Amino acid sequence: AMKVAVIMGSSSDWKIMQESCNMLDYFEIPYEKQVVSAHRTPKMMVQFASEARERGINIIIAGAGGAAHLPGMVASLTTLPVIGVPIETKSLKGIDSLLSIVQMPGGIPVATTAIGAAGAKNAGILAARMLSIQNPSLVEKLNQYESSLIQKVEDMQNELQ
Amino acid sequence: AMKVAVIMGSSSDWKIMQESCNMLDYFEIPYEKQVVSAHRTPKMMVQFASEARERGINIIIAGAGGAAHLPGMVASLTTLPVIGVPIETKSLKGIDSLLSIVQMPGGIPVATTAIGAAGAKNAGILAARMLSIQNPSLVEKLNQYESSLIQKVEDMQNELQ
Amino acid sequence: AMKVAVIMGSSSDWKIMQESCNMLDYFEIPYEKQVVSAHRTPKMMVQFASEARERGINIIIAGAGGAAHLPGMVASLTTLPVIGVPIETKSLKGIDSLLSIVQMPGGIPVATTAIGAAGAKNAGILAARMLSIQNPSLVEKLNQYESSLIQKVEDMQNELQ
Amino acid sequence: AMKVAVIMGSSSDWKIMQESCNMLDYFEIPYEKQVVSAHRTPKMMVQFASEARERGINIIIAGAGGAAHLPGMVASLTTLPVIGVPIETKSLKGIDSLLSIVQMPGGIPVATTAIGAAGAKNAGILAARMLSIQNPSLVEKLNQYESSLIQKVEDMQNEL
Amino acid sequence: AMKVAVIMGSSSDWKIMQESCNMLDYFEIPYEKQVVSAHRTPKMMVQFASEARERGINIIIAGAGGAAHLPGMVASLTTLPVIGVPIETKSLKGIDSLLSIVQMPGGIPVATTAIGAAGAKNAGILAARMLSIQNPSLVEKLNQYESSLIQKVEDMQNELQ
Amino acid sequence: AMKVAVIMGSSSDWKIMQESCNMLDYFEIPYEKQVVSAHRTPKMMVQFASEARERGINIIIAGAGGAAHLPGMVASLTTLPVIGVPIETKSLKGIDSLLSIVQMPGGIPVATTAIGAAGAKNAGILAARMLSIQNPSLVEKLNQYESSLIQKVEDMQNEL
Amino acid sequence: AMKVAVIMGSSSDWKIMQESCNMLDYFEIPYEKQVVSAHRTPKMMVQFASEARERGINIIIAGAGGAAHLPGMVASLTTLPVIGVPIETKSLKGIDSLLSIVQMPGGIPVATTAIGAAGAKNAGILAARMLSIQNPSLVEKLNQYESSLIQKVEDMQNELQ
Amino acid sequence: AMKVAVIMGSSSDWKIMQESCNMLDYFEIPYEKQVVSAHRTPKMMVQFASEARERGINIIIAGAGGAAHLPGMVASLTTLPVIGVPIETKSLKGIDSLLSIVQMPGGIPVATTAIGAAGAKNAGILAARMLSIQNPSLVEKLNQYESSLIQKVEDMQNELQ
């Protein structure tokens, strides 16, 4: 069965990270969500990452802000693909988040999304694309999603009043 | 049967993108490679991206620098996951490459790697992690890879002379 | 007959891109406006750009933000001059938009203006200057616009309180 | 007859700006090249820009680096379209050049291209596209140029 | 007799440049203030800069935003010292203004101060320091201003509630 | 008996981190050095950091570049003060390193120094300052160090 | 007895710097707080820094913004550890503050924390960790704080709604 | 007599700062030069700044890199105009130097010039313009310098014929 984990260091991250869960629901991909802090709960992060695959999780989506270490550290402790969402910060508006997630050393990858809500939405969509390789029923849903994007642009044509 | 496409806009990007191919070889994942330019051959890009899935491609790794539109445009034209590698730029150090790739709108994701050779290496490893959901024999190889990372660090212990 | 096209990937961009249309109206230059999304409607973008010259469009003004690919992709698909307007973004302050548009490779130019409303207004004025080469009636209008700018400065003198 | 002016503040900019001239020659578009400095010869710059249109210039391509004021000041003094090429600098890699040129407030436009040689090459090509409006001969030349760009990529298929 | 001119391209800049005038008033230094746009009124800019010294202007303080050319062009057209104040821009927060002003080539100097109100206030104070060389009675006022700065800090001590 | 640990994710960081050890030797402060990688040896990192205090370590100096997670993760796992040295990166000039180290959210601190060799030298000096609290012998050494800095400047006066 | 000093150039900085004092209170570490401006009260700064150790201060936490010189100058005038907190600035969002503080030359260190409230809170915690070396009672309090952070994360699990 | 002081933290800065002295010599303006380190010799810095005016110094030119505090701290301690030259740094290309110098909060000004050699050259010229208010023989020399700049450009025009 398909399963994604959606994780973040604080419940304050939820307004953003819920966008990943919204897309997973749209594609009918099961997920778990939880607060896992790289800095406040480092041992609970290590346990989560290490145990994820054997628990049946296929992909981890992880959001973090500032000195954003959660995605990279989780990726270092699992063989699963990890998608990292940079969360926008008060001062640097997510530039710190972006660089601290994307610039991983050769050897340990993180699939980095856009900063903020767009990135959280894209993490869910990216997870659906990844899962569509082994789960062919998703391909049709992905085709229909693409059609919905075309429809959205058509719907916007009369909004340049 | 697993297959990854490794693409880039120029042959001058090959010195970097060869790292992706190197890692795909390490995991025994079949690949094809070619030059696909978003700006010099936009129609060929459209055809390549649109037809990749039906031909048997599972993942596209796309490298580009500067006004680095290739990964995001390819992603817009396929239901496959696309991994985008920002190439370092002589002037702006790959900052233009990075922002052009990572900041995709909600709706069309690109899995963005680190700038340069690190990102290309990571694109290959990430593709293996993605394919390990569908192809379970890759998990053992990914575990072996972890072990080799640990050994690399052990070998460095006496080099602090 | 003169004709300009003003395009953007979202009706959310209209608040900015209307500035281009406002200046086209000032110079009495006919135009069309449309939503054309590089990522949500890539095939329609290809058709729009490819057909533009045959449809009698002389200049394309294209606005985009973030991973701002619309102007450069349109420019790759027509030999008309394309003016690219970077739209301000809520993390990188349009720096992503700007670099994505201006850093086009040798071979495929985009005439880039300032981030935001200033750039959209200036795209309209720039289109007027471009069209004045082969439409001499515009030269008088451009001279009169100079006079209006000088007058606007005079009208500001009493505001330094 | 068509005519483009290619200008720059220093002879040190010539290697870069010749890329503009090379593309103008490729498209058989006449041009003049000159050194015109916004900061060292401000009055000459004013005269050049003010008189350009009456002297038969259709487009001005202006390269500048650092506190790059030449394109914007020329644009403020002519009704002609001005294309600005940011020249790479040593400290800031042309970022100062780029922002000084592109960020014109509403009212006076500059068409800005990429930093350095790529931008210089593109200024010449952009000038050709501007002059191609309802001009089938130039449209043909631009289409042939497209064909060379496609060929360039197809040739690279074996260089991996 | 001492005189300073305070100039800017738009009345939108006045809410910043007013701090220059406020400090000049505090030091009892006569000034004039005017809108002079490098882009909208280039010929009047040339005239203003060229005539300033013979008119008895001692120093020009010039504010500009974005592609901020006013201070550098004025400096090129006068032998007077020119103080340049970068104005914060909506998108790039005055980094464009700052680089456009400060990065003048060797040969034509601009005395650059901080982005925004701090820079405008400091331009007025700097002008007083410059004028104090040939106008000795200003030294006493500058000493009194320093005393006022020490008092301001003392007044803040009970505000750490 | 005070002890400092100097750690880094690669021996290729030793180029920079040796400067920390050099200053510790200058102040006669005992130390150990080790390669500890946040991404390649995360489980070892956890052991090193969580056990540091029981191992007799008083201060940890950690260098890292790029996605520079080592100092912050180490800090999250110990009650010891952690000094983080950002290592210059070929592309982003250590700005990625700096932001990934300094921008710790409220709750877990890292004492961050300058990018590169300056920062590594300063991490060693900062550790000395930390150990000097109410320690007159180290205070004396720091005073002598101050005098050497003054002398260095005096020595440069005839070089203008 | 333990003692920390918390200083800042302006009472405007207090709403941020009070977080340092809040954490020192949490750990029962005695402190003094004062406005000390590197630029408005340079002589008083020099005296404060020079006398701090003699007066029994163990650690100085100093906040500063813009051309942020307070932490580096204080550090040059004491052999005590100095913690520098970059204050968020209106225009550059504390990037100026950060670079001005962190980029100290080899020879004179400043322990730099994050921009804004995070850095101020962390300066107090960092001072507690520093003092725990020679004040063993603080180790227990630091252990308590660690446990509290874990409990706070556990309390957030039901807030993803 | 007129007198300028040219100061810097290290003899490593002399290759750059000598450009200021070159221009002072061009205008026959007397000067002294000294190494003054804000961080290694802070008390000498305080003394130098505080005593400069009574000794006959009219203007201080100060160069500094990195956490470049010398110009701002000197300015805080004198009523003289202070010109600050940002010295290029290895990692950050003088961006740290620039922001640490130019971003002075309102109250204490520094006249900032370009990064590196251009800025040092311009500090000397700016000092001449400042001194020309009080010393009218300089106006003639500044007019001569204007003419020399025109000739330099004419020389380039003629060489490229």
Q: Which residues pair with D52 in a beta bridge?
A: none
Residues 6 or more apart whose CB falls under 8 angstroms from that of C103 comprise: B66, B67, B89, B92, B96, B100, D114, D115, D118
The answer to whether B39 contacts C76, with C-beta atoms less than 8 Å apart, is: yes
Best CA proximity match to F21, nearest among F37, F4, F2, F38: F4
Query: Please, are residues E67 and E87 in contact by the beta-carbon 8 Å criterion?
Result: no
H near B: at least 3 beta-carbon pairs less than 8 Å apart: no
> This structure's resolution (angstroms)?
1.5
The answer to whether H118 contacts D40, with C-beta atoms less than 8 Å apart, is: no
Best CA proximity match to F16, nearest among F68, F83, F96, F86: F86
A near C: at least 3 beta-carbon pairs less than 8 Å apart: yes
φ/ψ bin of B110: left (φ > 0), alpha (ψ from -120 to 50), beta (otherwise): beta
Q: How far is CA C21 from CA C59, E102, H85, in A?
A: 13, 35, 45
Closest-CA residue of D relative to E72 is D39
Residues 6 or more apart whose CB falls under 8 angstroms from that of F129 comprise: F142, G79, G80, G81, G109
Query: Please, are residues C119 and C113 in contact by the beta-carbon 8 Å criterion?
Result: yes
Best CA proximity match to A83, nearest among A64, A58, A61: A61
CA distance from start to end of chain H: 46
Residues of chain F neighbouring G117 (CB-CB closer than 8 A): 106
Residues 6 or more apart whose CB falls under 8 angstroms from that of D98 comprise: C102, D86, D112, D115
The answer to whether H67 contacts G105, with C-beta atoms less than 8 Å apart, is: yes
Please report, as a single letter, which amino acid is at residue C38: A
* Residues A85, E124: Cα–Cα separation, whole Å: 46
Of B43, B46, B67, the CB nearest to C100: B67
Of F10, F67, F91, the CB nearest to B156: F10
DSSP 3-state of H157: helix
Query: Please, are residues F34 and F5 in contact by the beta-carbon 8 Å criterion?
Result: yes
H near D: at least 3 beta-carbon pairs less than 8 Å apart: yes
The answer to whether H150 contacts D44, with C-beta atoms less than 8 Å apart, is: yes
Closest-CA residue of E relative to D38 is E73
Q: How far is CA G18 from CA D26, E58, G61, G82, in A?
A: 67, 45, 11, 17
Query: Please, are residues B9 and B39 in contact by the beta-carbon 8 Å criterion?
Result: yes
φ/ψ bin of A113: left (φ > 0), alpha (ψ from -120 to 50), beta (otherwise): beta
Best CA proximity match to H61, nearest among H141, H137, H120: H120
Q: How far is CA A153 from CA A143, C77, F15, in A?
A: 16, 20, 54
Cα of E138 to nearest chain G Cα, Å: 19
Cα of F158 to nearest chain A Cα, Å: 44
Residues of chain F neighbouring B88 (CB-CB closer than 8 A): 91
Residues of chain F neighbouring A39 (CB-CB closer than 8 A): 72-73, 75-76, 104-105, 107-108
Q: HSE of B96 in the Cβ direction (CA atoms, 13 Å)?
A: 27
The answer to whether H41 contacts F149, with C-beta atoms less than 8 Å apart, is: yes
E near D: at least 3 beta-carbon pairs less than 8 Å apart: yes
Closest-CA residue of G relative to H73 is G39
Of A109, A115, A131, the CB nearest to B113: A109
Q: Which residues pair with A65 in a beta bridge?
A: A87
Sign of the dihedral defined by the CA atoms of residues D88, D89, D92, D95, in that order: negative
Of B106, B117, B149, the CB nearest to A121: B106
Chains that touch F (3 or more CB pairs under 8 A): A, B, G, H
Burial of residue G1 (number of CB atoms within 10 Å: 0-12, 13-18, 19+): exposed
Of H88, H116, H150, the CB nearest to D40: H150
C10 touches chain A (CB under 8 A): yes
Cα of H86 to nearest chain E Cα, Å: 10
Best CA proximity match to H102, nearest among B14, D78, E94: E94
Q: Look up residue C86 and give its two tokens.
A: 């970077």
Chain centre distance of CA E155: 28
Q: Look up residue B134 and give its two tokens.
A: 């569908």
Cα of E134 to nearest chain G Cα, Å: 25
Residues of chain F neighbouring G123 (CB-CB closer than 8 A): 109
Residues of chain D neighbouring C72 (CB-CB closer than 8 A): none
Cα of G137 to nearest chain E Cα, Å: 29
The answer to whether G95 contacts A90, with C-beta atoms less than 8 Å apart, is: no
Number of H helices, E strands in chain H: 6, 5
* Residues B59, B66: Cα–Cα separation, whole Å: 23
Query: Please, are residues H6 and H31 in contact by the beta-carbon 8 Å criterion?
Result: yes
F near B: at least 3 beta-carbon pairs less than 8 Å apart: yes
- Method for this entry: X-ray
Cα of C10 to nearest chain A Cα, Å: 7
- Cβ under 8 Å to B: F residues 14-33: 14, 17-18, 33
Residues of chain F neighbouring B121 (CB-CB closer than 8 A): none
Cα of B129 to nearest chain D Cα, Å: 25
Binning chain H into helix, strand and coil, the percentages to the nearest 5 are: 50, 15, 35
Of D93, D150, D160, the CB nearest to B41: D150
* Residues D117, D122: Cα–Cα separation, whole Å: 8
DSSP 3-state of G78: coil
Closest-CA residue of B relative to D146 is B40
Please report, as a single letter, which amino acid is at residue B46: V
Of A94, A115, A156, the CB nearest to C11: A156
Residues of chain D neighbouring H95 (CB-CB closer than 8 A): 92
Closest-CA residue of H relative to F149 is H40
Q: In what order do the strands lie in the sheet with C59-65?
A: C31-35, C4-8, C59-65, C82-87, C111-112, D111-112, D82-87, D59-65, D4-8, D31-35
- Cβ under 8 Å to A: C residues 34-93: 34-37, 39-41, 44, 66-67, 90-93
* Residues E31, C154: Cα–Cα separation, whole Å: 19
| Residues belonging to chain C | 161
Residues of chain E neighbouring D102 (CB-CB closer than 8 A): 67
| Angle at CA of residue C58, ends C55 and C62, nearest 5° | 95
- Cβ under 8 Å to B: F residues 117-156: none
Q: Which residues pair with F112 in a beta bridge?
A: F84, G112
The answer to whether A44 contacts G153, with C-beta atoms less than 8 Å apart, is: yes
Of F9, F17, F35, the CB nearest to B157: F35
Mutate which: A39, A92, A108, vs F, most F CBs within 10 A: A39
Chains that touch A (3 or more CB pairs under 8 A): B, C, F, G
Q: Which residues pair with D112 in a beta bridge?
A: C112, D84
Query: Please, are residues B77 and C44 in contact by the beta-carbon 8 Å criterion?
Result: no
Which residue bears the tokens 């062919």? Answer: A136
Domains and CATH numbers, chain E: 1-161 (3.40.50.1970)
Of E58, E80, E122, the CB nearest to H106: E122
Best CA proximity match to B69, nearest among C82, C41, C86, C73: C73
* Residues B84, B72: Cα–Cα separation, whole Å: 8
Best CA proximity match to C38, nearest among B110, D146, B108, D126: B108
Residues of chain D neighbouring E102 (CB-CB closer than 8 A): 67
Query: Please, are residues A148 and A27 in contact by the beta-carbon 8 Å criterion?
Result: no
* Residues H64, H6: Cα–Cα separation, whole Å: 12
- For chain C, state the CA radius of gyration: 16
Cα of D109 to nearest chain C Cα, Å: 5
* Residues B102, A85: Cα–Cα separation, whole Å: 11
